[PDB]
Amino acid sequence: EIVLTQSPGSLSLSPGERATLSCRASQSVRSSYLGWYQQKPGQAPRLLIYGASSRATGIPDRFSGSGSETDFTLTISRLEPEDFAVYYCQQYDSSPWTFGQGTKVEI
Amino acid sequence: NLCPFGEVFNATRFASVYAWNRKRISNCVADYSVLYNSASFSTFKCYGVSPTKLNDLCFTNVYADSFVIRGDEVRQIAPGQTGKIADYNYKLPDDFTGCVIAWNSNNLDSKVGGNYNYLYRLFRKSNLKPFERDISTEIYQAGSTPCNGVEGFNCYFPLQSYGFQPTNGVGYQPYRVVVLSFELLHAPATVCGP
Amino acid sequence: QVQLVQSGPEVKKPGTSVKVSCKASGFTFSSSAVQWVRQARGQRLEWIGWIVVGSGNANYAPRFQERVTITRDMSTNTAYMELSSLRSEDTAVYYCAAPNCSRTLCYDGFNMWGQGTMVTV
Numbered sequence: 001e002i003v004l005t006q007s008p009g010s011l012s013l014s015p016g017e018r019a020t021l022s023c024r025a026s027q028s029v030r031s032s033y034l035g036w037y038q039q040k041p042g043q044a045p046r047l048l049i050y051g052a053s054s055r056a057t058g059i060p061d062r063f064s065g066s067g068s069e070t071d072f073t074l075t076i077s078r079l080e081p082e083d084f085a086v087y088y089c090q091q092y093d094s095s096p097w098t099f100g101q102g103t104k105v106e107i
Numbered sequence: 108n109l110c111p112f113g114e115v116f117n118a119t120r121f122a123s124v125y126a127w128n129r130k131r132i133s134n135c136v137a138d139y140s141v142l143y144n145s146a147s148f149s150t151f152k153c154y155g156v157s158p159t160k161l162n163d164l165c166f167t168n169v170y171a172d173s174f175v176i177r178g179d180e181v182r183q184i185a186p187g188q189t190g191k192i193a194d195y196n197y198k199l200p201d202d203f204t205g206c207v208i209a210w211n212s213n214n215l216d217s218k219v220g221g222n223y224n225y226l227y228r229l230f231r232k233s234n235l236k237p238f239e240r241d242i243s244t245e246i247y248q249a250g251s252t253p254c255n256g257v258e259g260f261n262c263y264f265p266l267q268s269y270g271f272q273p274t275n276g277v278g279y280q281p282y283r284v285v286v287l288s289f290e291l292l293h294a295p296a297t298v299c300g301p
Numbered sequence: 302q303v304q305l306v307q308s309g310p311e312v313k314k315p316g317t318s319v320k321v322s323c324k325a326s327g328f329t330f331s332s333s334a335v336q337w338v339r340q341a342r343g344q345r346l347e348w349i350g351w352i353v354v355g356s357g358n359a360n361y362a363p364r365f366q367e368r369v370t371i372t373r374d375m376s377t378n379t380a381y382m383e384l385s386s387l388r389s390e391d392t393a394v395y396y397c398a399a400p401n402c403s404r405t406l407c408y409d410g411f412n413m414w415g416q417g418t419m420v421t422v
Binding site: 001011031032035039043044045046047048050051054056057090095096097098099100102 | 360
């Protein structure tokens with residue numbers, strides 16, 4: 001069981017400035033076997049990036065990812081009104097594929 | 108004198124479809140009427156030749172391809188077919204000459220505890236060429252990222268087992284398939300019927 | 302238009318067994334694999350287990366390993382998940398998600414997600 005620490009639990013920030021989200025792993029995880037999901041309230045999650053630094057299709061250039069063995073970071077250049085949702089990371093490296101606590105971004 | 112057809116068709120354990128034995132038959136007389144008129148065969152379909160002219164005809168080489176496939180997959184061993192076996196395990200050329208022979212081997216291969224010895228290739232980058240034998244156990248690359256020899260997501264074991272059970276229906280019973288390929292070239296026809 | 306269309310919600314009494322399924326259309330199902338996750342209302346997502354439909358090999362998370370049987374039916378392009386001995390805390394929205402997979406190559410991420418089905422115990 002690879003526990004995924006999440007910090008911060010909540011994030012209150014105005015639109016237009018930068019944001020830094022943190023996915024912390026108990027032990028090292030392969031960079032390729034990871035993805036980020038945006039869950040809007042009352043909706044299914046939707047993949048944004050895979051392999052830490054590779055943006056998935058249909059996502060604009062503003063979203064970006066930083067890759068490292070034990071540290072993973074998602075950065076949004078410009079906050080938009082529809083981009084306020086709960087973000088989750090997942091590791092495909094080792095079973096079970098755990099999910100993070102989830103960071104809520106609001107204003 | 109007589110060709111060793113009996114050894115090929117009475118062998119105690121046959122091979123898996125992915126690695127199929129290739130025996131070249133030469134320098135002997137081939138009796139076909141014992142096999143053709145046998146009451147122990149379920150399928151005897153000839154392609155490119157007539158079923159009774161085999162005795163008259165003389166060929167340079169006879170190749171016996173022996174593999175175990177599942178009941179529903181017997182129809183795939185023919186020229187111009189597609190499927191898990193036809194494309195990834197055993198491909199015949201379009202100008203195939205010979206006969207495809209199959210019989211029900213449920214009481215020989217199936218085990219009550221589960222027969223897992225037989226395997227078939229499930230994942231391959233491209234379809235096989237005619238009579239191509241692929242025996243690699245290399246990890247399948249489903250995506251654009253490297254597996255590095257470790258399984259998991261998008262990295263799977265290419266082989267898969269059949270899982271033959273004595274309580275399955277006819278479509279899932281094991282059937283042994285011997286394919287007699289007739290190859291003629293510019294050499295003396297040392298193989299001839301009686 | 303590659304989608305994954307599952308069934309509607311169910312409400313079942315305690316101690317019965319629920320059958321959930323997801324039907325794929327528009328893409329080559331056999332190459333792909335399906336992951337099953339559940340999310341209770343107001344909480345995080347929990348990973349039940351994933352199966353490769355073509356191989357049929359099913360992996361299960363340790364907590365729910367005994368009670369989940371994840372099967373697939375290739376003919377109908379459907380992945381099945383069954384939960385037994387349903388307890389009151391098991392009420393959650395269940396999801397299924399598979400990577401968009403072409404015959405030659407697969408997408409590195411879980412692109413396609415399901416609509417979500419509520420299960421009440």
